[PDB]
Amino acid sequence: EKSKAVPFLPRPAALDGSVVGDVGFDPVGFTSWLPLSYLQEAEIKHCRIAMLATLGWIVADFVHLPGAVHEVSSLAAHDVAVKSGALAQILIWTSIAEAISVIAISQMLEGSGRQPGDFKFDPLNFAKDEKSLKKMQLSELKNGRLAMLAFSGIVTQAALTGHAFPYM
Amino acid sequence: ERSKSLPFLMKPKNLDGSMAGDVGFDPLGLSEINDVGVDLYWLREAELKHCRLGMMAAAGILFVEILGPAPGFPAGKSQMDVFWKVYAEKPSLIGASLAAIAILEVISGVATTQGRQNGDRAPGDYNFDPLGFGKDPAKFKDLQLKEVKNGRLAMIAAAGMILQGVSTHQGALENLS
Numbered sequence A: 001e002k003s004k005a006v007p008f009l010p011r012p013a014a015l016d017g018s019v020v021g022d023v024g025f026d027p028v029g030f031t032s033w034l035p036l037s038y039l040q041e042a043e044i045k046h047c048r049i050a051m052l053a054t055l056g057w058i059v060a061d062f063v064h065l066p067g068a069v070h071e072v073s074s075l076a077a078h079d080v081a082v083k084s085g086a087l088a089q090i091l092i093w094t095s096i097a098e099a100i101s102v103i104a105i106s107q108m109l110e111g112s113g114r115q116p117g118d119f120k121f122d123p124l125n126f127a128k129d130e131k132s133l134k135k136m137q138l139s140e141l142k143n144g145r146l147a148m149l150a151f152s153g154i155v156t157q158a159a160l161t162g163h164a165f166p167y168m
Numbered sequence B: 001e002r003s004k005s006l007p008f009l010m011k012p013k014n015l016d017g018s019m020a021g022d023v024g025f026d027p028l029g030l031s032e033i034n035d036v037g038v039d040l041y042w043l044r045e046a047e048l049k050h051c052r053l054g055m056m057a058a059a060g061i062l063f064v065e066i067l068g069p070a071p072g073f074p075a076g077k078s079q080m081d082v083f084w085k086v087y088a089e090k091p092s093l094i095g096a097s098l099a100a101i102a103i104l105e106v107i108s109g110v111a112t113t114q115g116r117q118n119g120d121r122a123p124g125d126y127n128f129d130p131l132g133f134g135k136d137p138a139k140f141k142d143l144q145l146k147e148v149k150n151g152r153l154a155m156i157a158a159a160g161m162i163l164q165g166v167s168t169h170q171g172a173l174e175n176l177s
């Protein structure tokens, strides 16, 4: 009762405390008719994709790969990269990863034990015990949400005003 | 048995004494509506939202007309017509404000319906007391009465300002003198 985020709204009844980044924020009750693991996986995937996208947009408006095709702004880079076939390679490998993801999310939903977003990818450690893993999961979630909103703002401002890196 | 405000009318059944500003002024018996998701809880929440919105709007009109606009913002003293001058030059501000108000209003409606269902939240309550001006009781009732009276007065005032600006196309205090 009385979820932490919205103090005047009831607790979403599906987010008690046992999830990283769980401040009880679900006013429209998306968790009431969708699996929690599915939504967590979707959120983490969005976080990672948008973090990579924000970093790439900002960097590519500064540094360009050698070649005349890579001499466009990130706003206009989509139509150039799709014509050159640059985005085709990313599409192919992302589709391979996403088919393996289809298998992984199916197994997670039907038992297994794989945590949402846990691909066990960890060449370095950066997370030795449970406490470090929880803290870094919270950091990843917060940074990913911030980067999703940041990429949203960057794209909207750049489309509104065709400016360089300062999209004001 | 008779309403305090209207002695020629019987006391409205649903308005005993609880809500701040209750004087029994329900001649049409609207407090007894229990259909289309509308009841005393919904009516009180709507009244409080109207009170707060009217207070904010009246304060904004008076502030802008007396102390002038903020730097970088248009002038004209007609608040119903300066809106189109702001939108003509800063449409993004208006759009962002509208989107924020839309999200907050969706949250407000969800909260109203939930609090009506599992009764734990008083109508118009959003737990918004950052400065702790209404922590203790015996002052909360007085603050509720002050808010309700000021909000009704500002509702009437803001409706008047809207109509005056739409019709006369002049400022509020311009109409005053």
Ligand code: CLA
Residues within 6 Å of the ligand: A049, A052, A053, A055, A056, A057, A059, A060, A061, A063, A064, A065, A066, A069, A070, A071, A072, A073, A074, A077, A078, A081, A086, A087, A090, A093, A094, A097
């Ligand atoms: C969402 C991810 C994403 C997407 C869709 C793109 C898309 C694009 N980038 Mg880009 N970029 C990204 C992230 C991304 N970038 C990141 C994170 C960086 C920082 C290193 C850059 C740095 C960058 C530069 C410097 C340039 C581009 C350019 C371009 C355009 C054409 C060439 C190209 O594909 O990039 C080539 C990308 C690189 C050389 C660096 C990519 C490094 C990756 C993203 C990090 C490692 C992630 C890993 C491989 C994930 C594995 C995927 C899995 C399925 C196997 C194209 C529109 C070029 C352009 O035309 O600019 C307008 C260009 O000059 N990008």
Ligand SMILES: C/C(C=C=C1C(C)(C)C[C@H](O)C[C@@]1(C)O)=C/C=C/C(C)=C/C=C/C=C(C)/C=C/C=C(/C=C/[C@@]12O[C@]1(C)C[C@@H](O)CC2(C)C)CO
Residues within 6 Å of the ligand: B080, B081, B083, B106, B108, B109, B110, B113, B162, B166
């Ligand atoms: C279904 C729903 C929402 C909901 C729900 C949920 C989501 C299901 C959740 C719950 O469970 C139930 C329920 C029902 O709550 C309904 C949504 C509400 C609506 C339909 C929104 C309406 C808002 C309209 C407003 C507030 C417009 C005001 C216009 C003004 C104009 C201003 C002007 O300046 C302009 C522009 C020109 C100037 O010249 C002069 C004037 C004219 C003054 C003043 O502001």
Ligand SMILES: CC(/C=C/C=C(C)/C=C/[C@@]12O[C@]1(C)C[C@@H](O)CC2(C)C)=C\C=C\C=C(C)\C=C\C=C(C)\C=C\[C@@]12O[C@]1(C)C[C@@H](O)CC2(C)C
Residues within 6 Å of the ligand: A141, A142, A145, A146, A149, A160, B091, B092, B093, B094, B095, B096, B097, B099
């Ligand atoms: C800034 C913003 C969001 C900021 C979010 C932040 C900081 C989030 C922080 C967190 O996530 C972290 C970091 C960690 C989480 O655990 C906790 C929180 C705290 C939640 C959203 C802006 C959101 C801004 C929005 C939605 C603006 C919308 C504007 C519109 C629609 C206007 C459109 C128009 O103006 C045009 C474009 C042209 C005109 O011609 C037509 C019209 C329509 C007038």
